[PDB]
Amino acid sequence: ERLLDELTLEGVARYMQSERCRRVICLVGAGISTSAGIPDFRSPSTGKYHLPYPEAIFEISYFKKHPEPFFALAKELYPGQFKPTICHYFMRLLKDKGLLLRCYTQNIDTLERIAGLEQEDLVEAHGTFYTSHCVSASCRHEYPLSWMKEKIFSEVTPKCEDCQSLVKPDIVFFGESLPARFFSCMQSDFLKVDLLLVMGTSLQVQPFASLISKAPLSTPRLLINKEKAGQSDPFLGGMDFDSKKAYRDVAWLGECDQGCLALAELLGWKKELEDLVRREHASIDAQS
Numbered sequence: 001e002r003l004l005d006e007l008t009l010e011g012v013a014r015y016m017q018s019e020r021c022r023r024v025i026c027l028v029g030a031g032i033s034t035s036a037g038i039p040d041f042r043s044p045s046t047g048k049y050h051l052p053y054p055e056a057i058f059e060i061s062y063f064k065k066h067p068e069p070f071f072a073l074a075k076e077l078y079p080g081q082f083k084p085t086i087c088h089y090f091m092r093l094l095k096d097k098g099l100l101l102r103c104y105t106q107n108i109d110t111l112e113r114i115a116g117l118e119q120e121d122l123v124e125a126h127g128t129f130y131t132s133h134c135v136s137a138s139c140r141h142e143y144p145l146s147w148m149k150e151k152i153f154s155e156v157t158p159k160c161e162d163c164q165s166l167v168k169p170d171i172v173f174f175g176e177s178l179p180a181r182f183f184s185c186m187q188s189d190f191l192k193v194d195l196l197l198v199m200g201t202s203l204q205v206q207p208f209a210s211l212i213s214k215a216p217l218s219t220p221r222l223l224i225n226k227e228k229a230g231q232s233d234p235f236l237g238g239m240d241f242d243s244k245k246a247y248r249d250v251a252w253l254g255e256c257d258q259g260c261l262a263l264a265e266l267l268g269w270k271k272e273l274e275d276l277v278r279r280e281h282a283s284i285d286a287q288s
């Protein structure tokens, strides 16, 4: 009856290599970047400016009035290196094998782009640090990450070279809307998906979580995550891994890198993935 012959990683791999599985959507969160040294900051467990309410450091109005706290925090939090993980390059391999329909990401850390996913491949649901824009509606001059980095480390508040307005990283602040691309792509992609690969997200933040209920009822959904997630909340189309009615949802519990390695091994891609990661990491390590 069901597309998966068994509710295991092996069943998912067999399905992926069957002619039935042509279009994969990845939904990813902070768990795919922790092994790169990027901490999960939506986690309250990780991490003077006289804010009227602390969220003002991420609220667009306060930023526009008092941007210095945000850029001081950005200097403190700036990564020492931008090296994507095995998981990121697994998605690049999906792209190379012609299986990747779209990667929806909650992360702003740019590692999807560094790993070789193109803008067309990506829905950065919470924005990105990869580009920044002048905040003046009549200008909107775009600046790359290197320019913003120089400004941040020199502790100069970044101003537009054309109009001297503030320049803001393209992350979604409080009081801003989610990008229209998120809804536009969701409405089209989920008519087309054969497999949902959910990696490194607890599916707790909305509307990003509700994406899993946009899949067709037959579409298998594989969670690769440290903890099970996405099931219906006993208090309030959720994941069903374990009931007798379960038919399409699979949980692989562990680090995202190790799960992607296990899946690649099942697919016969482990050598390809190892070679890609080793060469890309070497290229990043060698940046002079």
Ligand SMILES: Cn1nc(C(F)(F)F)cc1-c1ccccc1CO
Pocket: 038, 039, 070, 073, 074, 075, 077, 078, 079, 108, 109, 110, 129
């Ligand atoms: C520099 N910065 N600043 C912030 C903020 F201020 F918004 F919190 C976030 C980041 C950032 C940028 C790229 C990759 C990873 C991170 C965070 O680990």
Ligand SMILES: [Cl-]
Pocket: 029, 201, 202, 203, 204, 205
């Ligand atoms: Cl989450």
Ligand SMILES: [Zn+2]
Pocket: 134, 135, 136, 139, 140, 141, 160, 161, 162, 163, 164, 165
């Ligand atoms: Zn400008």
